[PDB]
Amino acid sequence: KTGHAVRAIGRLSSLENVYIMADKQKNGIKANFKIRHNIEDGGVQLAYHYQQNTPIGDGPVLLPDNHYLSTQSKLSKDPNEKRDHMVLLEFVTAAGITLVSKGEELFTGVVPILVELDGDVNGHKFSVSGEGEGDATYGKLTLKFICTTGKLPVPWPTLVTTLVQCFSRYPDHMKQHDFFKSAMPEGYIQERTIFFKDDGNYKTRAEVKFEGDTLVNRIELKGIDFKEDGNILGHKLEYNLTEEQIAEFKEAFSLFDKDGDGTITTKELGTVMRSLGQNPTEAELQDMINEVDADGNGTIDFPEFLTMMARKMKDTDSEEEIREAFRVFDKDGNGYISAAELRHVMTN
Ligand SMILES: [Ca+2]
Ligand SMILES: [Ca+2]
Ligand SMILES: [Ca+2]
């Protein structure tokens, strides 16, 4: 059962959020991050994102310290809709900094959203159209997307990140780091390249601005070098918790929180890893905690620990990640794990 504990450490060693830095050369920001698409019959497809945003207007913008965005997405179907479509529910929150603009005032209530995409992937063209609402106070998006060209030639999940980060909920201690809203109403250019592992890549250019009362995302997408047999063109990707597991998670939370005060410190996280033959520094342990530390108080409470495990249970890991999760039990590293190599890890 305490396999839960090993992947917790794997997750805390991973980088799963949307990382933002100021553009140190000009107004704007850069971002990079990783998406895991679950392959239908098991496996994972990874997509590496590299992102640049630049104001359209001349006025000043907020250039943030490094921090990140954290995401929850639910994709569904509308049972009374016959066109190729996607209903999306999304929560996005900023974090990563422990312990303001004009355009920010445009986001205090529910804002209507229009989304317009023209795409071309390996010569298969398509258009997508989206409408819905954004609630920045809760980092909440609700949208319906329609493929207006008939059938979509790529899986819907691969488009999500392309199809309005000015709707992120920035916590009160981080308001001065919201580049996205400060760029409004005139808005910003958002550019990405997206690299599907062992496959093609998408390139995207988007204009994000207010047109009247409406926040508009207008996008061009060109995709090349895809395999007609790969997970994208071949439509191999999945479309989208028991309180039994919540019991299994609080029990795995106790293994770290040895003094049971409801929170995990760098002190306690260090103990567990050292009993698994690792030796992380104080700076590493703070960085590990900071990746899943929603409130920025430097400790992982149980809400914060749940979110990370719900997300980790949602996503299949790659082989390079299961490899390392495997070589924690196999001490001699021979391919076959002995029931003695288990007990060592177990006791610890
Ligand atoms: Ca504790
Ligand atoms: Ca916390
Ligand atoms: Ca062995």
Side-chain angles (χ1 to χ4, degrees):
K1 156 271 144 186
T2 72
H4 289 308
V6 171
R7 62 194 145 212
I9 287 142
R11 167 67 192 95
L12 285 156
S13 307
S14 293
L15 295 183
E16 310 285 302
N17 307 335
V18 166
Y19 308 98
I20 288 129
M21 351 155 196
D23 201 319
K24 237 277 151 178
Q25 271 176 0
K26 80 219 195 236
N27 283 356
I29 56 127
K30 297 173 206 306
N32 66 259
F33 60 93
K34 207 168 74 215
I35 297 298
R36 309 167 175 277
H37 302 296
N38 298 340
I39 308 175
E40 184 82 306
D41 295 339
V44 75
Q45 171 70 51
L46 304 184
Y48 304 102
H49 289 67
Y50 302 83
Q51 179 184 321
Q52 163 73 55
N53 305 55
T54 312
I56 302 166
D58 294 303
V61 285
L62 300 161
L63 307 170
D65 294 340
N66 300 3
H67 69 273
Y68 69 69
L69 301 182
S70 174
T71 267
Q72 270 160 359
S73 298
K74 210 247 285 169
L75 276 76
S76 57
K77 297 294 181 182
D78 158 2
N80 299 317
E81 171 69 69
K82 284 204 197 192
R83 298 166 288 177
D84 198 352
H85 72 292
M86 163 179 81
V87 174
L88 174 65
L89 170 63
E90 190 157 295
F91 293 101
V92 193
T93 316
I97 296 175
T98 68
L99 294 130
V100 191
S101 62
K102 255 140 279 158
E104 193 200 330
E105 300 167 27
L106 303 157
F107 293 90
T108 48
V110 181
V111 169
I113 299 159
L114 228 73
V115 181
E116 223 87 67
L117 179 155
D118 284 326
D120 181 347
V121 170
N122 272 22
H124 307 117
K125 284 161 142 289
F126 58 94
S127 280
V128 185
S129 214
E131 58 154 32
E133 296 188 317
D135 198 357
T137 297
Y138 302 100
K140 192 186 183 174
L141 290 176
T142 37
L143 298 146
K144 208 214 195 174
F145 295 101
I146 304 294
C147 186
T148 49
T149 45
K151 157 112 155 145
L152 199 76
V154 300
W156 278 109
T158 80
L159 291 186
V160 174
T161 62
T162 296
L163 294 168
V164 289
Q165 293 172 306
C166 53
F167 287 108
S168 304
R169 184 189 137 239
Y170 276 72
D172 299 352
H173 67 284
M174 291 175 58
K175 297 307 188 171
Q176 83 281 37
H177 300 305
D178 193 344
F179 161 82
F180 306 102
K181 294 174 191 73
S182 79
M184 300 295 169
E186 318 92 287
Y188 53 76
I189 300 296
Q190 170 165 310
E191 297 166 291
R192 290 212 193 96
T193 300
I194 303 181
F195 288 108
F196 295 85
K197 209 204 158 193
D198 308 319
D199 219 323
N201 61 99
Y202 297 155
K203 279 154 203 189
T204 71
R205 196 176 172 282
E207 260 194 351
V208 193
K209 58 179 185 306
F210 274 90
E211 286 170 30
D213 65 331
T214 302
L215 191 282
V216 186
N217 185 27
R218 276 175 219 287
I219 319 135
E220 309 231 290
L221 181 161
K222 179 152 194 53
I224 55 183
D225 299 326
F226 280 88
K227 297 171 180 167
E228 311 276 338
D229 54 302
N231 300 305
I232 287 83
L233 292 180
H235 287 101
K236 287 170 183 177
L237 307 180
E238 255 184 51
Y239 184 70
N240 215 204
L241 275 183
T242 335
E243 42 203 305
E244 161 166 312
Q245 277 132 22
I246 293 169
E248 292 171 12
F249 282 150
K250 195 171 188 194
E251 204 236 289
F253 183 84
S254 288
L255 237 100
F256 290 93
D257 187 15
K258 281 155 201 297
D259 66 72
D261 81 328
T263 75
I264 301 167
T265 56
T266 54
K267 209 83 145 51
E268 287 161 298
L269 172 68
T271 306
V272 175
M273 294 180 76
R274 262 182 266 106
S275 73
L276 302 188
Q278 280 178 299
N279 193 41
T281 78
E282 188 61 41
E284 285 164 29
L285 291 163
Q286 288 164 325
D287 287 337
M288 288 174 82
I289 282 189
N290 189 50
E291 246 265 313
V292 295
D293 184 34
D295 64 20
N297 80 351
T299 63
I300 308 159
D301 55 69
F302 185 72
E304 295 172 340
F305 180 87
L306 253 183
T307 302
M308 99 172 182
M309 298 305 287
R311 211 137 86 76
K312 226 283 198 298
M313 218 84 182
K314 270 207 59 165
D315 295 332
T316 323
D317 311 293
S318 64
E319 41 210 39
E320 283 67 36
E321 291 156 36
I322 295 174
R323 275 277 152 273
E324 304 189 25
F326 197 82
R327 289 190 310 261
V328 158
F329 302 87
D330 212 313
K331 289 298 161 194
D332 47 58
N334 60 322
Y336 295 85
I337 287 183
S338 53
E341 274 174 324
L342 178 60
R343 170 141 55 206
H344 178 251
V345 181
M346 263 290 313
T347 342
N348 291 127

